[model samples]
Target chain A: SLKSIEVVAAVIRLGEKYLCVQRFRYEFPGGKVEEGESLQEALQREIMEEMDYVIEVGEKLLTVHHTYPDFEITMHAFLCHPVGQRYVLKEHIAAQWLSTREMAILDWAEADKPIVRKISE
Target chain B: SLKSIEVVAAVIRLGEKYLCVQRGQTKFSYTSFRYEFPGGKVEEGESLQEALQREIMEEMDYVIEVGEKLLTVHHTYPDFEITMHAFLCHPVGQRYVLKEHIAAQWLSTREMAILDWAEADKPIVRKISEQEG
Candidate 1:
């Protein structure tokens, strides 16, 4: 049976730009909630594994409900601050820092837009 | 250029069991700094939706509209494989909680054993607890 769950997303601000990663896999860098792990713990682990750094993930910004052809998902969004200036592109082809205007120019995923709009404004 | 960045992970607890998903890629489903979302690496020249579609197709056999730059991250291992990116995602589809995890349990912070978490995640956890408090 398929189940609904909570997920985490990071929003790193650098000066006047925000960082964005181009995905290479099917899911975001996030994974399922592990035994004994809290939602925050799962998010911390996933972000580090995908990106290679540490971040202070802030309060919950929003919660999204979605259903793919195979499974249903509930994702939780959060605000974050990058700990340092070390970023690597191991899985993705590239990563970039976009200004609010640049973020508007680039087309993003449907679920991702709400948060962008929140931050953009 | 090699870089180090910060990352975030959500460890949701359900009763006494924790949730874990099996990764179809080269990585453990559970471990310090392990486990991740259903989406994959962002692609070049692709809109967020296109990148998400490509990822969902490869992992979950579906497609989705990506949204939000929720978190930015930086992680560095002993092997020095650093990955940094903002997680642009939303919830979709039923999850196939994988068996790669040793045992997913919903334990309090005092019960958590995997201490290899990045410094940033620690603060977030503390913040959540404070809010709950």
Candidate 2:
């Protein structure tokens, strides 16, 4: 049996652009769900930890289940609104605000590709 | 176009049984005094989980730990349509005083199906029963 991971992502929207960041590769900002933490709670904490940004988690966008070579993950994605424009990058190498079409051009993590298409659609 | 309402519900669990509540009489006789997965309409700027938490606290005085999504139900009545998102939950404590409901019970999934559930909640009841079985 593969090790299964449960995680959450935030599609932070400002105007017509969405926030995308690069750790190893392009992806939305989020992290693993700690025990007893709800999806929203996990996303909020992950964003603050990874980006040093505060956010108001909004409605759920969708959930993506993907399998890597060694592990499987069920990632729940939600719409989010930033508290302010400023963010200090703590873990990611770079960050950008991209339109839906622009998001497709980046080298995205395999598990995160669906989210690009999802927001695009 | 008819009005639309978005609501969130909790299938609160404790050990082997889940909590179900009965609403007071309403304008719609079809729903009056019927059983429901406790929840209420979503307020502006509130996420489904937030709405569920608020509703539970306001109505039952019992804070809940919201869990994963269970199922969503869409149904139409004579006057309006509703989208109800139901989630699995666990209560923070065992004590509660129902502020709005007329009655409440903790029932197994099989017992939940026997109650006169509101039309919108029937699908969620079926989903839970199937999942439990």
Candidate 3:
């Protein structure tokens, strides 16, 4: 089987609100690794660059192993705390902080659902 | 003018054999961020996979799609460390350890050229170069 080892994910929480970013554009603020960074390091930098804010990362929460027709994916999720205020949305269409109940209502990406489910538990 | 912020780097070392990788055949190692695992900045009109593929090719001279994600990190820079989560990766061919100094070498506590390293990495480099207690 073809294999790739690099991957990362995060759950950003800001005060009472949480940060939920949508992937609409190509460089949608979440993608692959750069040259000399680990997955955690990449997530920290990517989230900051995409949202223009800092986030305190937590322990690994979950990992998802799945495969799409284009490629196979092994996604790792982490707990995150936002370090700044909700000021702007540069790469995403909209940003929201949904409660567990509210999260159920939104149509999340296929890969992201596992984290959402974990939070609900 | 276009602007972006997410970026990260690392100095990975395993014993005396510092992890120095090559950039060849798509997803080649030793690119700017490839050695560390997860890499690249989100690009315009690019998916995470697309952006990574382009970045690997541009820097490593490879042409392959990303297969999996290993870790996720969150942090700030110029303010704090750039949070990074690197995953273990396997490229298509045999990776060579090249050098531009930054390009390849055994990880060392001794600074080679003295370029401005990321704040978070200073401690890591120091630890790697330190004698065992």
Candidate 4:
């Protein structure tokens, strides 16, 4: 097949909680890989667009390769620290600072569950 | 969400447990081990049965007699999604000889649930699992 890889996302840690966004997945703030930009740049752009904030990209967290119905995807996740407002959300419903323990409480996107499973590790 | 892609899988039954395979470590599920039903992507001009037949032969080195459609799982993963059509199949002639998987196992439904599956098939797991790891 057909493979579509999206840009990296920042697991922006704000204290004990993480920045989570809701979409097809209840994932963190991030976006697509652009033509002439680095992964970091694309991540920053995505976070800014979705959360209206910026982040300091940290360690490479984990990579997710999940097969779907119409296509396949490879999601790159990174652990990051934030530098923008924590009180804004432009794309999803509510921006929440969810702790690792609370991850089970929300209806998580299947792919994002893997990242959260490694949150405490 | 709606079915985005069509995938074909073989549900080959052998006595107690069904046959399943471990995806390569180079792929997903690097830690806990995701054992998935060996299947293949449907080609543009290929039918579901045709694709699975080609896939099993190419991936597992065994010829199979395609059986009836068992179920269709519409599952979604981040960036990854598909409508998986699972079918009942029986091997023909020679015994199974692994050619593509890192390893293979004949697992019952419950046995499959215990292994770290990459995605879906969870629905089928409950129907087939309960003995624990």
Count of clashes, each model:
86, 0, 39, 15
Error of 3 at A116 (Å): 0.9
DockQ of each: 0.02, 0.02, 0.02, 0.08
**Per-residue error (Å), model 2, residue B14:** 0.6
Indicate the DockQ of the complex predicted as candidate 1.
0.02
TM-score of each: 0.43, 0.47, 0.45, 0.47
Q: Which stretches of candidate 4 lie over 4 Å from their true place?
A: A1-121, B1-3, B26-32, B75-81, B127-133
lDDT string for model 3 (A79-120, tens) is 877667654577435666656776777776655667778878
Worst 10 residues of 3 chain B by lDDT: B76-85
Between candidates 3 and 4, the TM-score winner: 4
Off by over 4 Å in 2: A1-121, B1-3, B25-32, B75-81
i-RMSD values for every candidate model: 16.5, 20.2, 15.4, 9.4
Question: Each model's C-alpha lDDT?
Answer: 0.49, 0.76, 0.49, 0.68
Q: Answer with 3 or 4, whichever has the higher lDDT.
A: 4
Tens digit of lDDT per residue, candidate 2, span B1-133?
0023577889999988999988675677565566888887676689999889998888888889999999876654322245778999998876888665368899998888678876567778888888767
The alpha-carbon lDDT assigned to residue B68 of candidate 1 equals 48
Judge candidate 3 at residue A89 and give its lDDT: 72
Clashes of 1: 86
Q: Give the TM-score of candidate 2.
A: 0.47
- The order by descending DockQ is 4, 3, 1, 2
Q: Rank the candidates by TM-score, best first.
A: 4, 2, 3, 1
What tens digits encode model 3's per-residue C-alpha lDDT throughout B1-133? 1112333222233444443332223345543332232244554565555556555556555444355543445542211122332322335434432324335444434432233333333333344446432
